């Protein structure tokens, strides 16, 4: 729902508060924004979710859009509920948040990106409710 300039500025900004070269390496202009798959890949510096693994930018047609709460329970399709994920079974369960195994794992980058406004309070809130019960 975001705009492609407004998409463009706020990984631009995001990657700058990582000291990221991904815009580097990987050049893009803000119209191919509109792919969310594309999009999610610069909102995670090219990196999985899930897993602490890269995402390969030529693989990305075989890559998973999982919902962080799955829209089963959740009427949510944006981005604040959505990642980039080389396979969505990497979730854990499929009937829940992602699993607290990925939680332990995983929370450390998903700080790294909420403190670079690259996800949301929501989306880190939602990201981390293994360890807080669930659903």
Same mark, same amino acid.
């Given at each position: 729902?975001?705009?492609?300039?407004?998409?463009?500025?706020?990984?631009?900004?995001?990657?700058?508060?990582?000291?990221?070269?991904?815009?580097?390496?990987?050049?893009?202009?803000?119209?191919?924004?509109? =792919?969310?798959? $594309?999009?999610?890949?610069?909102?995670?510096? &090219?990196?999985?979710?899930? !897993?602490?693994? /890269?995402?390969?930018?030529?693989?990305?047609?075989?890559?998973?859009?999982?919902?962080?709460?799955?829209?089963?329970?959740?009427?949510?399709?944006?981005?604040? =509920?959505?990642? $980039?994920?080389?396979?969505?079974?990497?979730? &854990?369960?499929?009937?829940? !948040?992602?699993? /607290?195994?990925?939680?332990?794992?995983?929370?450390?980058?998903?700080?790294?990106?909420?403190?670079?406004?690259?996800?949301?309070?929501?989306?880190?809130?939602?990201?981390?409710?293994?360890?807080?019960?669930?659903?």
């Amino acid at each position: 729902s975001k705009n492609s300039r407004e998409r463009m500025k706020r990984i631009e900004e995001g990657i700058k508060e990582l000291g990221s070269q991904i815009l580097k390496e990987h050049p893009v202009e803000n119209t191919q924004l509109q =792919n969310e798959k $594309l999009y999610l890949y610069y909102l995670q510096n &090219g990196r999985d979710m899930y !897993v602490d693994q /890269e995402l390969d930018i030529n693989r990305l047609s075989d890559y998973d859009v999982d919902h962080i709460v799955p829209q089963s329970f959740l009427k949510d399709d944006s981005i604040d =509920n959505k990642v $980039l994920t080389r396979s969505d079974k990497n979730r &854990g369960k499929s009937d829940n !948040v992602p699993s /607290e195994e990925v939680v332990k794992k995983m929370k450390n980058y998903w700080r790294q990106l909420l403190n670079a406004k690259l996800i949301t309070q929501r989306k880190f809130d939602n990201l981390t409710k293994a360890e807080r019960g669930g659903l």
